[PDB]
Structure 1
Amino acid sequence: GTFLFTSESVGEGHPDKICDQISDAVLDAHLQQDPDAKVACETVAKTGMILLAGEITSRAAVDYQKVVREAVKHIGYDDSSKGFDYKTCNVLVALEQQSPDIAQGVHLDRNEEDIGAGDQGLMFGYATDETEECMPLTIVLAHKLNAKLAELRRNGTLPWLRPDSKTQVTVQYMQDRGAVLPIRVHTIVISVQHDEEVCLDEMRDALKEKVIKAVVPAKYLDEDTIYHLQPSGRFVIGGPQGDAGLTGRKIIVDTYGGWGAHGGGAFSGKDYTKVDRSAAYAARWVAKSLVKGGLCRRVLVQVSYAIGVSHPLSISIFHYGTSQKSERELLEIVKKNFDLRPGVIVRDLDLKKPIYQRTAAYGHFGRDSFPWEVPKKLKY
C-alpha cells in the first residue's frame, strides 16, 4: 500500500530561474504601458551575460538595461565575489517584432473573445486534496525549503548563503482509493551556493536546524529520514558562472513536481495569447474548482489547441477513481461551467495585469492571491 514520490525545487538565484524571472520582468514592463503587448521573450544566462532573444510587438517604451539589472539586484547577485553582479554584467538584446504571418493568423482583425490560440499545443492542470492549497506535499515542501534559505540569507541569520540553491524531497505515501496520503519524509537533499569561509560541518548543522526543522513538521521526520546536505562537498562557484541558464527549463518545478502530467510548454516571457500559459492556468483553475467543489479528491485535466483556432480541440478529465461521478459526467460539468477560449480566459483570470514576475520562482500554483487559485462555484 505505500510508495515513494520525489519532487524538486530551485531558488531565485538558480540560473534557469534567473532567466524565468527576467523574462517575466520584461513581460510586466510591457504590460504596465500596453495591456495588449505581444511578448515572447527568452532569456539566456552564462558568466557575466544576460541575453534577451525573441519577439515583441508593443506600444511600450521599455528600458531593457534597467529591467534586467533591477531583476538581478532583487535576486541578490550584487558583487563579483558572489559570481555575478547586476551593476557590471553584460546585457545583450536580440529582440524583433512578432512575425506578421503569426499576427495575421492569430489576432489581427479578430474580436478579442474570438482571438485564435497563439500556437498549437497541449496543457494539463492538476489538483490534489492532500494539502489545503491543493498541491503535492513533495513540491510544497521543496519550494518552502528554498524560500527559507532566501529568508535567512536576506535577514543576515546565515550571511554565508548565496542566491543559487536546489532542494529535493522524497515522501512516503499511502494509497487511499485513488487519493494519496502523506505518511513521512524519506529523503531530503539541499545544495546551496556559499562563501569560501564557512566549513561543511557548520553548513550541514545550519541546514538541518535552521532550514529543515523550520519548514518540515516534526511528525514527518524520524530516525530513518535520510539527509543529503551539501552532498557535493563544495559549492562556492554558482549562479550563471557555475551552470548556464535558459528560460523555460524548470517547467516541472513551475507546475506539479512530477505529479499529474505536462504538455511541454514554458510559461515565462509569454503574454495571454500564448495558450502554454493561459490555458495551463485555466486548467489548474478547473482542477482546483473540481476538488474544492467536492467532486473529486485528485484530478488531471488535459486541453489542446491549434494555432489560429479559438476553441480547444480536446478536453479530458482523469479522476483516478476519486469521484462518484464518471469522468464523462465531470467533462460535461467542465464544458457547462468553463469557456477555455484564450480571449475569455484573459477576462476571467485578469491576464493583462503585470503580475507575472511574482509567478517566476517558487511555482505558479498553490500560491497566494492569483485568480486561477480561487475556485469557481460550479452549476450542475
Structure 2
Amino acid sequence: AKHLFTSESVSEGHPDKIADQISDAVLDAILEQDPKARVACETYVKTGMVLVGGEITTSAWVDIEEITRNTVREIGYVHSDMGFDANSCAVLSAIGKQSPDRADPLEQGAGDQGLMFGYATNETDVLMPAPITYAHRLVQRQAEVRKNGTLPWLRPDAKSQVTFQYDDGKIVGIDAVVLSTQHSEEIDQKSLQEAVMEEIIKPILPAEWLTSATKFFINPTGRFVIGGPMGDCGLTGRKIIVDTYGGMARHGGGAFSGKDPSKVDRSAAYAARYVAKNIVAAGLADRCEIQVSYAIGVAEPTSIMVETFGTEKVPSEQLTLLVREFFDLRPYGLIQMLDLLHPIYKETAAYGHFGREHFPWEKTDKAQLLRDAAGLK
C-alpha cells in the first residue's frame, strides 16, 4: 500500500548533538585510562556555556574543560559570529567522582531496570531503514563539504529530513527532502541552494528515487547565519530517535551518550541491534525488531520478544529459540560478546549509532551459525 514515512537527522554542531559528543568524549577519555570506569556524564549547552555534569566512579584523571573545548573546536565553533567559540565559552563541571573500593562475573545482575529495542531490515546495504540512512547521509555530507574546503561558507548547524514513499515494503522513491544549513553572511540564498543541491543532495540521494515530483525544501525560511548554542539549548539524550532508526522501530526511554557500558540502556540496545542484524543477514527474516528488558539486580532478561513482521523463514518459536541461545544477553555477557570496554564511543555520537559497519554491534559474524541451527538452507 502506498504510504509515506519520514525520519529527520541533524549534524554535529546542532546543539543537542554537541552535548552528546562532549559526553561521549569524556567517556572515551576516562575509558582510555580506566575501561572498568562507571560514568554517567550529562551535558547542557546554552549560548555562553557548556555545563558537564556527572557521576563518575574511576581512578582516572581527565581534564573536562580541555576535553570540552577540543570537541567544540573540531565541530567548528571557533568565533563569536558563528554563535559560539570553543576558546572563549564558559565550561562548568559538576561531576561527583568516586574512586573504587556473584562467583561468575557474567551472572552479575542488571544495574537499573528497563527496555531496549533493536531493528534490522533488508532494505539498505547496511541493513538499516532507508529514511534514517539517507537522512544521516545528507547531514554527514554537509559536514564533509563544510570541513573539506569545498563549500566553506557552510557553518556547523544543519538539519535534514527525507520522506519516502513505500508501496508495500518496497521503497518506491523520495517524495520530499528538506535541508537547512547555517551559513556565513557572505553567501546569497539562491547560490546557497544551487550548491546544496549540487554538492550535498545530488551525490547522496539515489537518482532513480528522485522524481519530477520530489519536493525539495532547501533553507525554507532560511537565512540561517547564527546557530549552534546561540539562542537555542542542547542537552544529551535529546536526539534519541536520530541516534536509533528515525522512528521506523521503537525505543525504550533511554539515552546512550555519557553512559559507560554497564548501562543496559546503551549496551543492551547495542546488543539488540546485533542480534536482529545477524538474524536478517542469515536470511531468517526480512525485517526484525527485538525488545529485551531487564530488572534491577536480576541477570537474565525479564523479557525477549521478536517481531518478524510476517517475514520469517522459520517460525518465531524457533527464532526466539536461537536468539536466546547464540547471544549472551546478561549485562556482563553482552559486554563480553561485543567487547565494549574500549574508547570507541565519541564516534558514535553523531551520524547514528547504527548502520556504520565498523562498530562491534554491526558485525554479522554469527550469520551462518544462526542459519544452520535455524534449519540450514
Inter-partner Cα distance in structure 1 for 2:107 and 2:257 = 24
Q: Secondary structure of 1:323's match?
A: coil
Instruction: Choose the corresponding residue for 2:274, options 285, 288, 297.
Output: 285
Inter-partner Cα distance in structure 2 for 1:336 and 1:36 = 27
Report whether the alignment pairs 1:79 with 2:82: no
1:184-205 CA distances to partner (integer Å, 9 max, x unpaired)? 1100010111111211111111
Q: Secondary structure of 2:202's match?
A: helix
Aligned positions of 1:1-380 closer than 5 A: 1-97=1-97, 111-175=104-168, 180-375=169-364, 376=366, 377-378=369-370, 379-380=372-373
Q: What is the deviation of 1:20? A: 0.6
Inter-partner Cα distance in structure 1 for 2:126 and 2:339 = 21
Inter-partner Cα distance in structure 1 for 2:54 and 2:110 = 18
Q: Which runs of 5+ in 2 are unaligned?
A: none
Q: Secondary structure of 1:347's match?
A: helix
Q: Secondary structure of 1:358's match?
A: helix
Aligned partner of 2:195: which letter? A
Q: What is the deviation of 1:241? A: 0.7
Inter-partner Cα distance in structure 1 for 2:323 and 2:102 = 30
1:56-107 CA distances to partner (integer Å, 9 max, x unpaired)? 0100011111111111111111111211111111000011146x9xx9xxxx
Aligned partner of 2:182: which letter? Q
1:272-310 CA distances to partner (integer Å, 9 max, x unpaired)? 111000000000000001000110000110000112222
- Detail structure 1 runs of 4+ shifted over 6 Å in the superposition: none
Inter-partner Cα distance in structure 1 for 2:35 and 2:144 = 33
Q: Secondary structure of 2:242's match?
A: coil
Q: Secondary structure of 2:62's match?
A: coil
1:305-338 CA distances to partner (integer Å, 9 max, x unpaired)? 1122221100000000001322222111111211
Inter-partner Cα distance in structure 2 for 1:83 and 1:139 = 28
Q: What is the deviation of 1:358? A: 0.7
Aligned partner of 1:129: which letter? N
Q: Which moved more, 1:292-301 or 1:328-337?
A: 328-337
Inter-partner Cα distance in structure 2 for 1:111 and 1:34 = 22
Q: What is the deviation of 1:137? A: 0.8
What TM-score does the superposition give when structure 2 sets the normalisation length?
Answer: 0.95
Aligned partner of 1:290: which letter? I
Inter-partner Cα distance in structure 2 for 1:331 and 1:97 = 41
Q: Which runs of 5+ in 1 are unaligned?
A: none
Inter-partner Cα distance in structure 1 for 2:352 and 2:79 = 27
Q: Secondary structure of 1:39's match?
A: strand
Q: Secondary structure of 2:267's match?
A: helix
Inter-partner Cα distance in structure 2 for 1:337 and 1:72 = 41
Inter-partner Cα distance in structure 2 for 1:233 and 1:264 = 33
Are the counterparts in 1 of residues 21 and 257 from structure 2 also a CA contact under 8 Å? yes
Q: What is the deviation of 1:112? A: 2.8
Inter-partner Cα distance in structure 2 for 1:109 and 1:287 = 30
Q: Secondary structure of 1:40's match?
A: strand
Aligned partner of 1:75: which letter? I
Inter-partner Cα distance in structure 1 for 2:34 and 2:297 = 22
Are the counterparts in 1 of residues 49 and 90 from structure 2 also a CA contact under 8 Å? yes
Q: What is the deviation of 1:115? A: 2.3
Q: What is the deviation of 1:110? A: 6.8
1:223-243 CA distances to partner (integer Å, 9 max, x unpaired)? 100011101222112001131
Query: RMSD across aligned C-alpha pairs, in angstroms?
Result: 1.5
Are the counterparts in 1 of residues 118 and 270 from structure 2 also a CA contact under 8 Å? yes
Q: What is the deviation of 1:368? A: 2.9
State how many pairs are aligned: 369
